[PDB]
From Swiss-Prot:
Consequence recorded when altering residue 20 to C: Nearly no effet on specific enzymatic activity
Gene: E
Gene Ontology molecular-function annotations: lysozyme activity
Protein name: Endolysin
PANTHER family (UniProt xref): T4-TYPE LYSOZYME 1-RELATED
């Protein structure tokens, strides 16, 4: 398993504009288009993103292209972030994937807000950190996904995704 396979399990693939768990306009593999309530604003962002007139629909090809960009941006954001970088560097390969997953879902900013958990992950206090991560809006709003990510941090293995 790798980051792409992991995210693709968590996000799914939709070739038509759709709404977030959050109600936001999205397409592809969890590519947020706009936080704005207009389908029209979303359509406009979509065409801007792809470089063609899409009329709200893309190909698999285009979806994966956006996906490659989003993953690349997530990793680069982590590396540029003063709070994130140190944690990332301290982690093993599997756990690194779990941090990347969080960043992709919630953005650099959102994750950098989990001060106490970050501290515990750096210290390699896996069980403690898993309990602290669960105490969040994130876990209450998307519990099955959060619990997959959390197990990943707890165990350092891909078991949560084996099932799936």
């Amino acid at each position: 398993m790798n980051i792409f396979e992991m995210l693709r399990i968590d996000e799914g693939l939709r070739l038509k504009i759709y709404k977030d768990t959050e109600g936001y306009y999205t397409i592809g593999i969890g590519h947020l288009l706009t936080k704005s309530p207009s389908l029209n604003a979303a359509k406009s962002e979509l065409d801007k993103a792809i470089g063609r007139n899409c009329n709200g629909v893309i190909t698999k090809d285009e979806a994966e292209k956006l996906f490659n960009q989003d993953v690349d941006a997530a990793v680069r954001g982590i590396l540029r972030n003063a709070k994130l970088k140190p944690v990332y560097d301290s982690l093993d390969a599997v756990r690194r994937c779990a941090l990347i997953n969080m960043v992709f879902q919630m953005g650099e900013t959102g994750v950098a807000g989990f001060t106490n958990s970050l501290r515990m992950l750096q210290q390699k206090r896996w069980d403690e950190a898993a309990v602290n991560l669960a105490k969040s809006r994130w876990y209450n709003q998307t519990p099955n996904r959060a619990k997959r990510v959390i197990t990943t941090f707890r165990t350092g293995s891909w078991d949560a995704y084996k099932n799936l």
